[PDB]
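Appendix C. Worked example: Protein Atu0742
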Amino acid sequence: MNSEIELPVQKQLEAYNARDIDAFMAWWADDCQYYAFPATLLAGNAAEIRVRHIERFKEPDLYGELLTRVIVGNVVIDHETVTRNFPEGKGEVDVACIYEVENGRIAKAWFKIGEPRIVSQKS
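Step 2, the predicted output written as structure tokens:
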């Protein structure tokens, strides 16, 4: 059972669209690392991680619609589609946010954005 690895990523994914930064920060480590595609350290601790996302939570159009989630031991891939506002239309970007949970808290987290998509250009 990798239940204590599922507990962070479940509560945070819900909190991402539900606009709860307290739970979206809770299940992380205080020294948690946060990289951007490919491997660019945005945050070397929890305090910088939350603030970075709070800026994203200012968008009323922010919605993470999960498609698929897989878990390999202490690691989870949450593959969601972030609804944004792009000047060509919708603005929905299919991202794979990968996490690493150590001692019950996310020790490290990385994300890679797949592509930009639009409803007018998609079935």
